[PDB]
Design a protein around this ligand. Structure first.
Ligand code: JFV
Length: 282
C-alpha cells in the first residue's frame, strides 16, 4: 500500500502495536559473540543491545578492537551510517578513535546527557574553548572551536588532532536537544528541519566516511533518524515514489543492527516524518 493512506488505515484501526510486533517477529537474528566476551562487559551500556559480529566497527588496535557500534550500509539509497551507543566513561577515547579511523565528518547526538534524572551518556566533548580534552588511551586531542545554540538544536565545530601524527580535522557536532523525556514529538517539523541541516553540511555525503549517530542505546531515536533519511532519498531516486515501503526499509536496516525503532510510537512518528518530509522536498 501507499504510505499516507496505510497510515490513516492503521490509525483508524488502532493496530500500531500489532504492526510493530510483526516487524519484531520478522527481524534478523545474527550472532554477537564478540560483544558478549567477559573482557567487554564495561564497554556495553545495556546487556540486551549489542552489535552483530558481521557488521560491527573494529577499532584499529591489536589489544582489544571492540566498540558497541554497527555499520548500516544501504545499497540502493547509496548511504551509509554508523549507529552507536552513547559513550561511557571508559569508552570516550574509543569513540573518538572510531571517528578518526572511519574518516567521519559529522556526529549526530539525539539525547541529552541527563534525562529522567539519570546519566544517559558521558560528557564526551569540551564545553569551553580554552578547556580542551586529551584522551590518553587513544592519543587524541579535542578542542571546541565554536558553538551555535538554536531553539531545537545546537551545532558545534570541533577540532580533532591525532597526537601521534599531528594531523588535524574539523568535525561537526549536530545536537538535537528537544526530544521529550517520554514519548515522541507531537510534530515532526523540528526533527525534519534538523535532518536537513545535517544534510546541508556535507556530513552525509560520499566524499566523507559514514556519519556517526547516537542516542543512549543507539537503536531508538537513532533508528528514526536513519530510517527517515533513507526513505526520503529513495522517494527522490525512484520513478514511482509511492513504491517506497517503510516497513521493508526498516527490516533491511535491522539486518545490520538489532532493535532499530524501540516502540510502536516511534514507528508511527517515523511514518509521520517521511510523509510530511515528502511534501516539503517538492
Ligand atoms: C558553529 O558551527 C557552525 O555553525 C558551523 C561552522 C562551521 C561549519 C559548519 C557549521 O554548521 C552548519 C552551518 C550551516 C548549515 N546549513 C548546516 C551546518
Amino acid at each position: 500500500m501507499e504510505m499516507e493512506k496505510e497510515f490513516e488505515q492503521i490509525d483508524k484501526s488502532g493496530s500500531w502495536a500489532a504492526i510493530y510486533q510483526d516487524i519484531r517477529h520478522e527481524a534478523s537474528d545474527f550472532p554477537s559473540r564478540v560483544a558478549k566476551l567477559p573482557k567487554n562487559k564495561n564497554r556495553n551500556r545495556y546487556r540486551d543491545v549489542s552489535p552483530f559480529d558481521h557488521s560491527r566497527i573494529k577499532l584499529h588496535q591489536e589489544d582489544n578492537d571492540y566498540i558497541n557500534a554497527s555499520l548500516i550500509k544501504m545499497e540502493e539509497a547509496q548511504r551509509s551510517y554508523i549507529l552507536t551507543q552513547g559513550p561511557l566513561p571508559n569508552t570516550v577515547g574509543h569513540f573518538w578513535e572510531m571517528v578518526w579511523e572511519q574518516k567521519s565528518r559529522g556526529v549526530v547526538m539525539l539525547n541529552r546527557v541527563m534525562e529522567k534524572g539519570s546519566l544517559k551518556c558521558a560528557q564526551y566533548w569540551p564545553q569551553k574553548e580554552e578547556k580542551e580534552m586529551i584522551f590518553e588511551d587513544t592519543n587524541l586531542k579535542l578542542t571546541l572551536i565554536s558553538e551555535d545554540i538554536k531553539s531545537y538544536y545546537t551545532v558545534r565545530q570541533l577540532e580533532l588532532e591525532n597526537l601521534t601524527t599531528q594531523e588535524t580535522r574539523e568535525i561537526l557536532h549536530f545536537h538535537y536537544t528537544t526530544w521529550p523525556d517520554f514519548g515522541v514529538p507531537e510534530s515532526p517539523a523540528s526533527f525534519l528541519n534538523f535532518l536537513f541541516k545535517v544534510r546541508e553540511s556535507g556530513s552525509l555525503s560520499p566524499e566523507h566516511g559514514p556519519v556517526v549517530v547516537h542516542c543512549s542505546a543507539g537503536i531508538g531515536r537513532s533508528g528514526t533518524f536513519c530510517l527517515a533519511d533513507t526513505c526520503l532519498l529513495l522517494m527522490d531516486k525512484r520513478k514511482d515514489p509511492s513504491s517506497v515501503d517503510i516497513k521493508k526499509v526498516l527490516l533491511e536496516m535491522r539486518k545490520f543492527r538489532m532493535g532499530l525503532i524501540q516502540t510502536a510510537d516511534q514507528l508511527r512518528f517515523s511514518y509521520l516524518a517521511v510523509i510530511e518530509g515528502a511534501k516539503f522536498i517538492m
